[PDB]
Amino acid sequence: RKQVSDGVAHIHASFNNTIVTITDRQGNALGWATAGGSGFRGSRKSTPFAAQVAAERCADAVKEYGIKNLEVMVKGPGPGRESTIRALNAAGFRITNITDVTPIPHXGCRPPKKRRV
Amino acid sequence: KFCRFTAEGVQEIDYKDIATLKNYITESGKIVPSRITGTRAKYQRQLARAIKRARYLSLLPYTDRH
Amino acid sequence: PRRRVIGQRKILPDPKFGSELLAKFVNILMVDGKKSTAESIVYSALETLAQRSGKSELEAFEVALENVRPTVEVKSRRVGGSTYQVPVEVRPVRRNALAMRWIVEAARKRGDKSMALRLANELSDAAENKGTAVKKREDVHRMAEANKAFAHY
Amino acid sequence: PVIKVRENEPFDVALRRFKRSCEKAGVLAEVRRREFYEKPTTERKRAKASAVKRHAKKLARENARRTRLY
RNA sequence: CUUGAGUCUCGUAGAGGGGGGUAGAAUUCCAGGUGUAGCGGUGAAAUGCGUAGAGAUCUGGAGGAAUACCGGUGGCGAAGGCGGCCCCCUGGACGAAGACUGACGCUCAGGUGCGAAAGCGUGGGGAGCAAACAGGAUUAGAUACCCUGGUAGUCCACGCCGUAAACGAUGUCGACUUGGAGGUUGUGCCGGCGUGGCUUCCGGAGCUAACGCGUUAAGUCGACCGCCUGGGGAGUACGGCCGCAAGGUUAAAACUCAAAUGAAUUGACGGGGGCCCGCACAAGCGGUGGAGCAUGUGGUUUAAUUCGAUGCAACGCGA
Ligand SMILES: [Mg+2]
Ligand SMILES: [Mg+2]
Ligand SMILES: [Mg+2]
Ligand SMILES: [Mg+2]
Ligand SMILES: [Mg+2]
Ligand SMILES: [Mg+2]
Ligand SMILES: [Mg+2]
Ligand SMILES: [Mg+2]
Ligand SMILES: [Mg+2]
Ligand SMILES: [Mg+2]
Ligand SMILES: [Mg+2]
Ligand SMILES: [Mg+2]
Ligand SMILES: [Mg+2]
Ligand SMILES: [Mg+2]
Ligand SMILES: [Mg+2]
Ligand SMILES: [Mg+2]
Ligand SMILES: [Mg+2]
Ligand SMILES: [Mg+2]
Ligand SMILES: [Mg+2]
Ligand SMILES: [Mg+2]
């Protein structure tokens, strides 16, 4: 329905998955998509390509808002960081800023124990 | 390299001169390794102390992305 | 091999129309080294198709090859005991090799009376995307596309 | 790290300046070190091993330069 | 008597200790906004969470625990240990040139004090993590490794416990015996020349079974203390002491063996590594395993089914 013309797209790049949430300047979400929600599970869901497809699908999913410019929040270690950005840029969005938003405890809480794989 | 505080013989690094501490903090906000600057050890300790003080007084950010 | 010291081999040009493509194709169709019977079956089939089409033998056969020539196949690859189909590229010569092979086999398992007739109407429907061979081009293409997300190591 | 896609900026080189800022900022470094708990003794062991192998490498290549290979 | 030992004055460095305050990042939980079919997790999965609206993103709030960067074979402490920032109380170390005492010293059985983590008692706290436990897988089984959860505990105060590969597996003090490259912190003379404290690495003589150690000795000496006397039984039993308990400490015997042990050497092996080869993989093409038959084998049968070969490297083998 409504039009914003300016957005901020949040990328949650984990090792298992990649989530692309498009909001507006005040943090109210416009739309989103995920690698797992796009025909990939397990191995492929954790690939740069699935992340890319999720970014373009989320672009399509916010078509009805006329967004042109996007700040970029990349969050997390996963490989889905850059592929999703190039998908959002090639999709026809004018990228303006790129900020890494990964949480860094300045100590913090005890992480889980090492896996003895 | 060339540790500066010994060049000018400063006694204490004085958290107040932020423009001085501006050069020994990363623009993300982090203290820069003494190896990278060539500051001397005693002076790098004074540096860390004064940077954390000026952080407590909110004259320098703890991070780039508060 | 572990060496890569394989030079290329010479292959005879065909008598009827001077096509090494037909010599390769007949070497695929051949069994037990009965080369004369293979070349004869094949010239028969290609003249049957040069009449049921009118284009030419060379050209009806190229039209059957292109419509069946695939451009990307998958390559098995083991990662964590799991076996990954990774879509690799193909050099042109492997493309036409695969085309000719799939075409000969999909003709072999057909149900006409003779074999030259099977290959003739096979290459015809191959040229019209109704044969098992263009179907295998399709299977290899969608196999590459599905696992295309592995277009890297 | 924040990245300004400047005026007239080609998007790919601003992408690469982003890559540089994340790589020299230490972001994947921190996430992969902080993913799991480390015994204090374990990381003392690892830092000591890093430094000793580095100084041993220094002095190895120090004794190397004064020899002819063939 | 003053060099051993110690006192006084100026200075310097440090996560040394005890008590209080305060800050930022982050996790979890709560209230609400947007927003929509997933999320999460794994080698792959499932358990689990989500249309009762999850995850994601935003605003606000509560709470606990640790203090990224600095950060460093950097520092301090008897050892155990000690790390955001600020304040209060407090121990020690070292340096410079003096003034003072006058052997006041070293070591230490018995004794006393301190003493990681786990554990225990009382009373708080509880975010994250996580023995026990529960489920999901894996597996022949899987009381595990992996996943999803999760309680004591981990945090605080007081008291107890007194043990660790509490290690440099190297007792303390003092003296002496070539070097080299560094770190850290004083200080004298003018980036250069001196002299100290602590400290990392290499290495000489020498020592060592060797490995190695080597002015920070495992070199050359002296003082004193602790400890060892083949392996197992056994740091166990009994008794004493200590402890709320868990247990700690002191500490045997019978009996059994001819070894058990250390260092280094040549091989071999490794689900260690590096580099190469081979119809060994891949690529292909044709076979075998199914049927009828030939032949050999095994085994059953027989008086005999002669004897021998019988993983690869015996089985159309001696023939
Ligand atoms: Mg985990
Ligand atoms: Mg005693
Ligand atoms: Mg405790
Ligand atoms: Mg308790
Ligand atoms: Mg668990
Ligand atoms: Mg003991
Ligand atoms: Mg210890
Ligand atoms: Mg130690
Ligand atoms: Mg000992
Ligand atoms: Mg003593
Ligand atoms: Mg040595
Ligand atoms: Mg006992
Ligand atoms: Mg015990
Ligand atoms: Mg060969
Ligand atoms: Mg093969
Ligand atoms: Mg058979
Ligand atoms: Mg015999
Ligand atoms: Mg026989
Ligand atoms: Mg026999
Ligand atoms: Mg044979």
PDB file of C-alpha atoms in Angstrom, chain A residues 19-101:
ATOM      1  CA  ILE A  19      17.478 -13.929   6.897  1.00  0.00           C
ATOM      2  CA  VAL A  20      16.847 -10.710   4.956  1.00  0.00           C
ATOM      3  CA  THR A  21      14.462  -8.326   6.732  1.00  0.00           C
ATOM      4  CA  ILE A  22      13.538  -5.050   5.031  1.00  0.00           C
ATOM      5  CA  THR A  23      12.194  -2.334   7.344  1.00  0.00           C
ATOM      6  CA  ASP A  24      11.825   1.439   7.170  1.00  0.00           C
ATOM      7  CA  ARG A  25      14.003   4.111   8.828  1.00  0.00           C
ATOM      8  CA  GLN A  26      12.231   3.706  12.192  1.00  0.00           C
ATOM      9  CA  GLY A  27      12.692  -0.072  12.269  1.00  0.00           C
ATOM     10  CA  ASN A  28       9.176  -1.075  11.207  1.00  0.00           C
ATOM     11  CA  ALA A  29       9.545  -4.073   8.906  1.00  0.00           C
ATOM     12  CA  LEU A  30       8.253  -3.976   5.334  1.00  0.00           C
ATOM     13  CA  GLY A  31       9.002  -7.589   4.357  1.00  0.00           C
ATOM     14  CA  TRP A  32      11.426 -10.474   4.609  1.00  0.00           C
ATOM     15  CA  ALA A  33      12.590 -13.795   3.170  1.00  0.00           C
ATOM     16  CA  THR A  34      14.956 -16.619   4.116  1.00  0.00           C
ATOM     17  CA  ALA A  35      17.278 -19.109   2.445  1.00  0.00           C
ATOM     18  CA  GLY A  36      15.390 -22.044   3.967  1.00  0.00           C
ATOM     19  CA  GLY A  37      12.098 -20.575   2.758  1.00  0.00           C
ATOM     20  CA  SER A  38      13.321 -20.625  -0.842  1.00  0.00           C
ATOM     21  CA  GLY A  39      13.672 -24.320  -1.685  1.00  0.00           C
ATOM     22  CA  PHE A  40      16.876 -25.154   0.180  1.00  0.00           C
ATOM     23  CA  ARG A  41      17.506 -27.029   3.423  1.00  0.00           C
ATOM     24  CA  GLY A  42      20.616 -28.061   5.304  1.00  0.00           C
ATOM     25  CA  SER A  43      23.600 -27.870   2.975  1.00  0.00           C
ATOM     26  CA  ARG A  44      22.245 -25.426   0.385  1.00  0.00           C
ATOM     27  CA  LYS A  45      20.361 -23.282   2.921  1.00  0.00           C
ATOM     28  CA  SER A  46      23.827 -22.529   4.370  1.00  0.00           C
ATOM     29  CA  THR A  47      25.318 -21.406   1.048  1.00  0.00           C
ATOM     30  CA  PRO A  48      25.994 -17.944  -0.432  1.00  0.00           C
ATOM     31  CA  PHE A  49      23.647 -18.775  -3.319  1.00  0.00           C
ATOM     32  CA  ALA A  50      20.584 -19.449  -1.162  1.00  0.00           C
ATOM     33  CA  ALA A  51      21.299 -16.206   0.691  1.00  0.00           C
ATOM     34  CA  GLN A  52      21.435 -14.376  -2.649  1.00  0.00           C
ATOM     35  CA  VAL A  53      18.112 -15.835  -3.761  1.00  0.00           C
ATOM     36  CA  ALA A  54      16.586 -14.878  -0.412  1.00  0.00           C
ATOM     37  CA  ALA A  55      17.787 -11.287  -0.813  1.00  0.00           C
ATOM     38  CA  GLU A  56      16.299 -10.951  -4.287  1.00  0.00           C
ATOM     39  CA  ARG A  57      13.049 -12.616  -3.193  1.00  0.00           C
ATOM     40  CA  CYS A  58      12.794 -10.185  -0.278  1.00  0.00           C
ATOM     41  CA  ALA A  59      13.414  -7.374  -2.750  1.00  0.00           C
ATOM     42  CA  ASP A  60      10.456  -8.650  -4.784  1.00  0.00           C
ATOM     43  CA  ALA A  61       8.485  -8.956  -1.548  1.00  0.00           C
ATOM     44  CA  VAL A  62       8.863  -5.237  -0.824  1.00  0.00           C
ATOM     45  CA  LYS A  63       7.997  -4.208  -4.403  1.00  0.00           C
ATOM     46  CA  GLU A  64       4.692  -2.643  -3.290  1.00  0.00           C
ATOM     47  CA  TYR A  65       6.477   0.047  -1.234  1.00  0.00           C
ATOM     48  CA  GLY A  66       8.563   1.809  -3.896  1.00  0.00           C
ATOM     49  CA  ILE A  67      11.789   1.707  -1.897  1.00  0.00           C
ATOM     50  CA  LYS A  68      14.840   2.937  -3.794  1.00  0.00           C
ATOM     51  CA  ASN A  69      17.671   3.471  -1.290  1.00  0.00           C
ATOM     52  CA  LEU A  70      18.848   1.082   1.429  1.00  0.00           C
ATOM     53  CA  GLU A  71      21.177   1.116   4.360  1.00  0.00           C
ATOM     54  CA  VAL A  72      22.622  -2.344   4.954  1.00  0.00           C
ATOM     55  CA  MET A  73      22.908  -4.082   8.328  1.00  0.00           C
ATOM     56  CA  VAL A  74      24.975  -7.264   8.051  1.00  0.00           C
ATOM     57  CA  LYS A  75      24.746  -9.386  11.187  1.00  0.00           C
ATOM     58  CA  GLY A  76      26.708 -12.537  11.875  1.00  0.00           C
ATOM     59  CA  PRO A  77      29.511 -14.804  10.654  1.00  0.00           C
ATOM     60  CA  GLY A  78      27.822 -16.715   7.831  1.00  0.00           C
ATOM     61  CA  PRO A  79      28.832 -16.695   4.171  1.00  0.00           C
ATOM     62  CA  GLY A  80      25.469 -15.149   3.345  1.00  0.00           C
ATOM     63  CA  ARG A  81      26.889 -11.676   4.021  1.00  0.00           C
ATOM     64  CA  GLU A  82      28.142 -10.426   0.658  1.00  0.00           C
ATOM     65  CA  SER A  83      26.008 -12.498  -1.723  1.00  0.00           C
ATOM     66  CA  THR A  84      22.828 -11.082  -0.195  1.00  0.00           C
ATOM     67  CA  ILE A  85      24.219  -7.557  -0.571  1.00  0.00           C
ATOM     68  CA  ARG A  86      25.003  -8.039  -4.266  1.00  0.00           C
ATOM     69  CA  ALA A  87      21.554  -9.561  -4.735  1.00  0.00           C
ATOM     70  CA  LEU A  88      19.946  -6.491  -3.152  1.00  0.00           C
ATOM     71  CA  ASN A  89      22.120  -4.167  -5.264  1.00  0.00           C
ATOM     72  CA  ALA A  90      21.609  -5.929  -8.605  1.00  0.00           C
ATOM     73  CA  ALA A  91      17.898  -6.211  -7.761  1.00  0.00           C
ATOM     74  CA  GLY A  92      17.551  -2.482  -8.443  1.00  0.00           C
ATOM     75  CA  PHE A  93      18.076  -0.930  -5.009  1.00  0.00           C
ATOM     76  CA  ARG A  94      20.420   2.050  -4.600  1.00  0.00           C
ATOM     77  CA  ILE A  95      22.670   1.096  -1.674  1.00  0.00           C
ATOM     78  CA  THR A  96      23.793   4.108   0.367  1.00  0.00           C
ATOM     79  CA  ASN A  97      25.406   2.911   3.642  1.00  0.00           C
ATOM     80  CA  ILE A  98      26.711  -0.465   4.884  1.00  0.00           C
ATOM     81  CA  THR A  99      27.132  -1.092   8.628  1.00  0.00           C
ATOM     82  CA  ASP A 100      28.217  -4.303  10.377  1.00  0.00           C
ATOM     83  CA  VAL A 101      25.967  -4.907  13.382  1.00  0.00           C
TER      84      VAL A 101
END
